[PDB]
Structure 1
Amino acid sequence: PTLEWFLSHCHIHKYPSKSTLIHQGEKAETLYYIVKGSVAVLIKDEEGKEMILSYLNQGDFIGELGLFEEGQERSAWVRAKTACEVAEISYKKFRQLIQVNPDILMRLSAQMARRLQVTSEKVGNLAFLDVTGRIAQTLLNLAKQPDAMTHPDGMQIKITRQEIGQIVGCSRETVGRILKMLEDQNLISAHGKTIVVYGTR
């Protein structure tokens, strides 16, 4: 449909792992779209602690905020998590496609609504719910993600002990303590990054 009409003017260019698709400081002159794989977006402070806002899997767009208002810069950093195939379309030639077919814009701004609902309703849980409650909800949220692999016992995901604290809002030390505590009670499992939870499904 409209999606196929979008790939007719794209520029196929594969990006290796640990690459740089979006550099905070450069000029936004290329729209990116995810075909296969996944990518992560995060920011940094003055020390070195990271902070992931939201994850973007396949079928999502990369850097679309610098399209509505011409003359902007890259907000956050976008590092390629895994081998992903991303297209390339200049914003200049994109604006001409909207004036002749606004329907194409109805697709991009359609995914910008869900990314706001999962963030606004998350703040409330990061002010009342304790560590046990915040992490508990996170386990189910990551299980609903398409990048999650089906497990005979439950769900198998791969996330570090830092990214967890960046979602529930806490220190990295606290995460490791509770994580190992649930292991003794036979509730979940962890072997570095891969965390297999139980009770799901």
Structure 2
Amino acid sequence: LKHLDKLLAHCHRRRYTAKSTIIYAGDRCETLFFIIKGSVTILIEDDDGREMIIGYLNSGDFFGELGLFEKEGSEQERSAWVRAKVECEVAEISYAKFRELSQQDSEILYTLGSQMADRLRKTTRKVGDLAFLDVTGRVARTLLDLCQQPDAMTHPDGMQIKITRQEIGRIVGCSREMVGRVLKSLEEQGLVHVKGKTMVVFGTR
């Protein structure tokens, strides 16, 4: 991504502590972000106003990019909340500067497009998971999927991931008590071992 060098030269670096909200859904859109270090959580509210975790983005990912685009070329609003998952260092750049550099080098838009396409694939699969799987299947699939994503650690017996019961519940759309019951069953069946802030998922190497 050497073609991003000229974009990062015009970025202001900001640090966000874990759990701090970077983007609030519904806000105006004038700024694009690039994750230098750390990771962020993408959240929406369901129709009950209850929060659901859509996914995570990691170093090398842009976020806040969808606000560049609108159907009639009118004002656009932030489509989700973005919250630091761990301590994050982000590069912030105005839409106005991004537009000038992307007009100078379309490779920047190829990188942005590649990331948006990946997110659309993942979110489309999430529709299927919510429709096709019951909660036990959704919890198991979430655990397996997280083992293949950044910040999973190779473990002698599988992969180790940084996640809590509450987070899994917000990902799969069930109660915090229900995820406890499901995870207990999955532990007894040999898929997972739950720890304080981490979980070990067996058979994922």
What is the TM-score with the length of structure 1 in the denominator? 0.88
> Between Structure 1 and Structure 2, which shows a larger proportion of strand residues?
2
- For the pair 1:22 / 2:26, whether they are aligned, the reply is no
Residue 68 of structure 2 aligns with which residue?
67
The structural deviation recorded for 1:192 is: 3.8
**Which residue type is aligned with residue 77 of structure 2?**
E
CA contact (8 A) 2:147 2:201 kept: no
Distance in 2 (CA, whole Å) between partners of 1:189 and 1:81 is 22
1:180 to 172, 177, 184: 184
Matched, 1:164 2:165: no
Is 1:132 the counterpart of 2:136 in the alignment? yes
Say whether residues 1:105 and 2:109 are aligned partners. Answer: yes
Q: How far apart in 1 are the matches of 2:68 and 2:80? A: 15
**Structure 2 counterparts to residues 3-152 of structure 1, below 5 A:** 3-45=4-46, 49-69=50-70, 71-152=75-156
Q: CA shift at 1:66, angstroms?
A: 0.8
1:147 partner letter: D
> Structure 1 pair 73/48, CA: closer, same or farther in 2 (3 Å)?
closer
CA contact (8 A) 1:190 1:196 kept: yes
**What is the CA–CA distance in structure 2 between the aligned matches of 1:90 and 1:170, rounded to whole Å?**
38
Give the aligned residue type for 1:28.
Answer: C
2-structure distance, mates of 1:24, 1:125: 24
SS at match of 2:37: coil
Instruction: Provide the residue aligned with 2:158 in structure 1.
Output: 154
Q: How many corresponding residue pairs?
A: 201
The verdict on how the C-alpha distance between 1:47 and 1:131 changes in structure 2, with shifts beyond 3 A counting, is closer
Matches of 1:107 and 1:116 in 2, distance apart? 14
Q: After alignment, is 161-170 or 96-105 more displaced?
A: 161-170
Is the contact made by 1:51 and 1:163 (CA closer than 8 Å) also made in structure 2?
no
**Distance of 1:28 and 1:174 partners within structure 2:** 37
* TM-score of the aligned structures, taking structure 2 as reference length: 0.86
Identity percentage of aligned residues: 66
Which whole-Å CA distance do the structure 2 matches of 1:174 and 1:17 have between them?
Answer: 26
Deviations 1:18-70 (A, max 9, x none): 32321334322211100111111112357663201121111111100111346
C-alpha contact 1:161 1:193 (8 A) present in aligned 2: no
Q: 1:111 to 1:160 in 2, by over 3 A?
A: same
1:191 to 176, 181, 195: 195
Separation of aligned partners in 1, 2:36 and 2:43 = 21
- Measure the CA separation in 2 of the matches of 1:167 and 1:37: 20
How far has the Cα of 1:166 moved from its partner? Answer: 3.5
